Design a protein around this ligand. Structure first.
Ligand SMILES: Nc1ncnc2c1ncn2[C@@H]1O[C@H](COP(=O)(O)OP(=O)(O)OP(=O)(O)O)[C@@H](O)[C@H]1O
Lengths: 80, 96, 444, 96, 109, 85, 97, 109, 96
DNA sequence: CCTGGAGAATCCCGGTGCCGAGGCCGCTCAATTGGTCGTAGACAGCTCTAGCACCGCTTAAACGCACGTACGCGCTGTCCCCCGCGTTTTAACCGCCAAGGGGATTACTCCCTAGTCTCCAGGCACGTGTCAGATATATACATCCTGTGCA
DNA sequence: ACAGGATGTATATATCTGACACGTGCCTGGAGACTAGGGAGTAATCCCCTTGGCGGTTAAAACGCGGGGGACAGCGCGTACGTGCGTTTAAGCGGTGCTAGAGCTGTCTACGACCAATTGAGCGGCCTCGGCACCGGGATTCTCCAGGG
């Protein structure tokens, strides 16, 4: 797998910005958004993989993701 | 031929997306991105579908909040358009 | 065992038999190497004895070496005037001022060492501790010895860190609260002796051990002047508003942490409080007098003293009582004099003597209970009025005998207004407990 | 059958019928409510445990729960929750 | 003999399980001992908070011309009340969305 | 009659003190309206912390607020303080 | 004729001085009176240890210094040099208070 | 008779109190049972973190030329280091001051 | 005679002698180091407790401590700390 | 510079299918009841430390004031960059099927940990002296700022 | 663009002091040695759920183009803030006096843990039906020229 951060298309970043409430978006915003998304995802995925390794599983579970998010301070309601 | 002014469609889309509640990123590209990021920490992982859905939900929420703070910064700087420097200021004051 | 007459080196010296014998006693104490306490209350005078002692040490065997006197700032120019009057041979130096003045004075006078006697205050002593420690001291005189009555106090520690060959404590009331502070004074006198803290176990043993190195005489049985005092305690029951204020405070927003302190000055003037005062100062009028029982008592006593001497006294314990009484004095078109820490020191001190006059026709002189110093030649006073009593009977004794100078040849009167069913009764009970302890331990 | 999974779902449904008699809930909303109840339980219990440790004690009691509620809930919610808990303890003591 | 088993929830008049809360407290490793009234207090508090949020959610769902409470209604109820927002300020509700707000500058002249 | 309220204790913290705080922060020019806002922000922060500390002291059944109570309240707020317990 | 520094050099030297120093900047007695007045609201007849007020003062100084740092960042973002109440409010809004 | 008592810290080559850590784990209400190697592991980790911070603080103190360590040196060590800054990001060190930094825009030119 | 208090001061001073022979510490700095050790202990122990509860086990072990260290520390510190702890347990199991 | 049409966009309104919400049933495991015991904690008594209130003196800090100067804040002009829209391409989405990996469960065994007792040595409170840090004092240096010639 | 002066600041030296490092006595908790029991390791089995392929449909993304609005720089002004000075004030340090209240001991009791028997409350599984989603058609509303006001 390679070059999959580009799958986060410009229309999707525009839709997220529109939900945020922004009207005008500069051209350099998209690379910055891809970077910040990658950093956040990497933190959460590392913590989830640590939980999964402790459980000695090979499958990452919704509970693992929720526990990682709770550790980060970003509690998620709905999946467990 | 009828043509809208630059900013009517943006406001209509703002209302539409702030009314809706669905995910705003493509599921398969997000899933491939998650698998790619997981490739580094451990080889040959498997994922439940709910795990990928929860990850996508959290990512959407984080980006939405960040964009809201960026919009506040851009309005503070007497602008309408958001910029990378706006995002960076938002992150720095958040605590990253 | 010394000269029975006045020394030949003292000018205008009219010291009497008690003073010459006390000088001989101090001389003999120096000869035997024992440091003592001169416990003459007020009348015999101790400044004269100290000056004569230093003059003896100078004009006799050659020890004009570094000598130190510690006095409060309220008595600095008084001590300088006494030194220049009685024995002008000594070159006393007064050490007062801020950083630059202190530096100029020390560098230009103290370091060259042409001086003979250094007079400073406790605060300047603490300030210049380090520069003072270098000089080897032959004789250290501490006036008002009850200042160092408490061990582990900064002045006590510093004065103990000095290297003094001889020591001398001056105090008019050696005992104030208990035997531990007296032991502290004895420890400063001779640290190598009274290392341990400890009517047959007490009183008599302390009297016998104090007799070799303590001397105390009484103005009545020595001077034969200063006619006795008739003390009257007038019991005044607080009026309805005062009683209800007392109850409403005792049973109960406003901060009430120290119940004892807050209940106290309420009998004196219930309007010193913050937020419980009546409306804004619309005018100065009959609001102060009528609303306090002690105020109505003093106000009805005043016309008698006016039709009579009208130069009597005022004594109280709170600066806010002092301020409200100042406002009352101005409203009643009377004139007073003010002595307090806030008023500039050097200029208040000469103002006191300035106001000392054969005639004033101003009917009021107002003093605080602790603001009293060591001078104040109010021989014009006739009665002492105590608005309230303090915990220490010694403070009240100092306040009452401040107006009992010899300048006073007529019998002085002591008036006390006391509020019934209040805390004044206990305060009086403690005070009399302490006074009885002091009397039995010293006078008996 | 499969293993059992505890949930607060039936109690949440009963409370819902108490407040709005003719309304219903979806499975996702019930999952959210179950998570909310677990989260609040965790916060209150952890705060009470820390209180018991600080006071050098070994029992969790109604005083500890009340103090935790005061610390965690803001303002009006704290007031009303303390009132309700006191009422429930009074009823339990009387009807025991 | 023995009387009919009366649940402690019915004894306290609560809709939440007092005995289950007691067991969760004992097996949660919060303290060595658990008092009798602590489960009752905790169940009452949980009931009050649940009733509050469900009342707000029901009103929101009614305003939308629906009779089933969905995460959108829960999110609106939580974010439109300041105390519940402060309680759930760090919490993300799945399929909730955001509150409609547009900053007044962006509105056309 | 000579008696009146002295001041208000929020005015006890002063303009020069706030200027020193801003200098430590790294500020050069300061508007004149900053001081009222800083007083309000400080009041809010102290209110929250003191409320939590008073709750802890009430639970302990004491009438004295201790440094341990302040440290526990700060840790609750997410502002851990090292150097008092 | 008298020597005068231009408007902004003494400020910079104060920045350096107070960033090198370590002691507390608010006055102890005013801060203690403020703490007691605030405690009056929640409970009457309260005592304070000496260490409690010092810990409170340390926390207040740290909080205000960090807030002013973020305020300066916002003011520079708006291409100003002066800080404003709107800068303070933006800092608080982004931090989440 | 009995053998001479060797401390578990000595057995594991540590300068931290393994037995005290074990007692704290058992009385801190973290689980029902505690392993033998868990206190040893925790003591070693605490030792490593303490050694790291003390080394950095001592270097800072030597840079300022003081042979004693003060909270100012502790704060200077904790900042200027990304890992320890992440660890103690939300921790205030009493009388430790602030890192010297002035924004370049304010600098005169 | 005053009651006793348990502190890490002796061990901190030993580590200081090990890492800087001719250097000292002050009382306030020692209090800060004591607080720091207590805080890190609390964080690691709480993470281990929650891990054991998640996996439905009643015993905290070296696996739990290792995972808690990996979760709470950022990167290089985590790696070096894991090496340290593994070395310590190996030496402890070697003959004891 | 305000109206008035066009023209998209949105809302409203009726009808059709579907699938998840709500009810019902059987079963079993967790909560209730009853009885016993041993320790945590409540309560009273006593000690002595630390907090509260006040005064006196010094001096650093705060406060009020005057002057000028950068600095914030409108205004204007240029132009470039982003938005709105039509078109083409690409890949997501959806349904279906097949296959295996790995999560989940159960039974069995044994090894590690808790619980006790004994005793002894590490660690803590207390006391003490000396050295590192604080302070003062006079160089030496560095930095700012304005003024004068001649760039 | 430099000279010189006037601030401020870093450096080197001498004194003094109070806090730190060390020592000593004592005691309470940790180590050494034993027991027993249940929690976790291990193996084996089942089945479900994840991955992987595959084809068709269609929405969504990529691409290009034109134009208008907003960013950004420049300029001017007039005002509010920094700087320095002289006056006032109250903070900080030292003392005093007192007492509440925190902290430790002793004692007993009532409350929670524990165990056994019992039973009904809740959970999984199942069926069914009304609320919701979608759809198309018509009515209302917002936006943008263009034009005669
Ligand atoms: N020149 C003098 N002639 C006679 N008696 C004198 C003289 N100077 C002082 N005294 C005595 O001293 C008494 C009080 O004088 P003064 O006020 O100077 O004393 P003091 O220094 O304040 O005393 P102390 O501090 O020892 O109580 C007089 O009543 C008198 O007995």
């Amino acid at each position: 797998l390679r070059d999959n951060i580009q799958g986060i298309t410009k229309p999707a970043i525009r839709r997220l910005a529109r939900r945020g409430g922004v009207k005008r978006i500069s051209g350099l915003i998209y690379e910055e958004t891809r970077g910040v998304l990658k950093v956040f995802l990497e933190n959460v995925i590392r913590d989830a993989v640590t939980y999964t390794e402790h459980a000695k599983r090979k499958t990452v579970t919704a509970m693992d993701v929720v526990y990682a998010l709770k550790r980060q301070g970003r509690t998620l309601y709905g999946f467990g | 031929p009828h043509r809208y002014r630059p900013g009517t469609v943006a406001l209509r889309e703002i209302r539409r997306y702030q009314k809706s509640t669905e995910l705003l990123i493509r599921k398969l590209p997000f899933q491939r991105l998650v698998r790619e990021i997981a490739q580094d920490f451990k080889t040959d992982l498997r994922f439940q579908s709910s795990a990928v859905m929860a990850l996508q939900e959290a990512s959407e929420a984080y980006l939405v909040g960040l964009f809201e703070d960026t919009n506040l910064c851009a309005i503070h700087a007497k602008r309408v358009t958001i910029m990378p420097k706006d995002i960076q200021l938002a992150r720095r004051i958040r605590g990253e | 065992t010394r000269f029975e007459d006045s020394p030949s080196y003292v000018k205008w010296g009219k010291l009497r038999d008690y003073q010459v014998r006390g000088l001989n006693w101090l001389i003999s104490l120096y000869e035997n190497g024992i440091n003592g306490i001169l416990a003459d209350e007020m009348g015999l005078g101790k400044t004269l004895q100290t000056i004569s002692l230093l003059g003896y040490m100078k004009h006799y065997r050659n020890i004009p070496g570094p000598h130190m006197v510690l006095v409060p700032k309220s008595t600095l120019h008084n001590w300088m005037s006494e030194f220049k009057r009685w024995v002008p041979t000594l070159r006393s130096v007064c050490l007062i001022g801020d950083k630059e003045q202190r530096a100029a004075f020390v560098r230009d006078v103290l370091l060259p060492g042409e001086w003979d006697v250094c007079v400073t205050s406790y605060e300047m002593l603490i300030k210049e501790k380090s520069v003072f420690k270098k000089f080897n001291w032959r004789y250290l005189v501490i006036d008002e010895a009850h200042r160092i009555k408490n061990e582990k106090s900064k002045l006590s520690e510093i004065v103990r860190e000095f290297k003094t060959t001889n020591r001398l404590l001056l105090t008019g009331t050696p005992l104030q609260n208990n035997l531990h502070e007296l032991w502290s004074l004895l420890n400063f006198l001779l640290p190598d002796v009274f290392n341990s803290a400890d009517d047959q176990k007490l009183v008599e043993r302390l009297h016998m051990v104090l007799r070799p190195f303590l001397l105390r005489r009484i103005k009545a049985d020595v001077e034969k002047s200063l006619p006795p005092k008739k003390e009257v305690k007038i019991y005044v029951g607080l009026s309805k508003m005062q009683r209800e204020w007392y109850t409403r405070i005792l049973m109960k927003k406003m901060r009430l942490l120290n119940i004892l302190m807050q209940l106290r000055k309420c009998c004196n003037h219930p309007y010193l409080f913050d937020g419980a005062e009546p409306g804004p100062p619309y005018t100065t009028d009959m609001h102060l007098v009528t609303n306090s029982g002690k105020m109505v008592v003093l106000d009805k006593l005043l016309p008698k003293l006016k039709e009579q001497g009208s130069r009597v006294l005022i004594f109280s314990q709170m600066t806010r009582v002092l301020d409200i009484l100042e406002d009352y004095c101005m409203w009643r078109n009377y004139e007073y004099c003010r002595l307090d820490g806030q008023t500039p020191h050097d200029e208040r001190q000469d103002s006191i003597n300035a106001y000392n006059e054969p005639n004033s026709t101003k009917f009021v002189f107002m003093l605080s209970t602790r603001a009293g110093g060591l001078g104040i030649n109010l021989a014009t006073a006739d009665v002492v009025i105590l608005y309230d009593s303090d915990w220490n009977p010694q403070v009240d004794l100092q306040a009452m005998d401040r107006a009992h100078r010899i300048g006073q040849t007529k019998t002085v009167r002591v008036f006390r207004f006391i509020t019934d069913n209040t805390v004044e009764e206990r305060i009086v009970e403690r005070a009399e407990m302490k006074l009885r302890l002091d009397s039995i331990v010293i006078q008996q | 059958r499969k293993t059992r999974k505890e949930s607060y779902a039936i109690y949440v449904y009963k409370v819902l019928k108490q407040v709005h008699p003719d309304t219903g809930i979806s499975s996702k909303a019930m999952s959210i409510m179950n998570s909310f109840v677990n989260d609040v339980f965790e916060r209150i219990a952890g705060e009470a445990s820390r209180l018991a440790h600080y006071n050098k004690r070994s029992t969790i009691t109604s005083r500890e729960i009340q103090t935790a509620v005061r610390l965690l809930l803001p303002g009006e919610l704290a007031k009303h929750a303390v009132s309700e808990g006191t009422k429930a303890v009074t009823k339990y003591t009387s009807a025991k | 003999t023995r009387a009919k088993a009366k649940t402690r929830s019915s004894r306290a008049g609560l809709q939440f399980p007092v005995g289950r809360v007691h067991r969760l407290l004992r097996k949660g490793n919060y303290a060595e001992r658990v008092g009798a009234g602590a489960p009752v207090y905790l169940a009452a508090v949980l009931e009050y908070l649940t009733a509050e949020i469900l009342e707000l959610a029901g009103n929101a769902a009614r305003d939308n011309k629906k009779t089933r409470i969905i995460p959108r209604h829960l999110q609106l109820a939580v974010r439109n009340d300041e105390e519940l927002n402060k309680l759930l300020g760090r919490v993300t509700i799945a399929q909730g969305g955001v509150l409609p707000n547009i900053q007044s500058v962006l509105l056309p002249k």
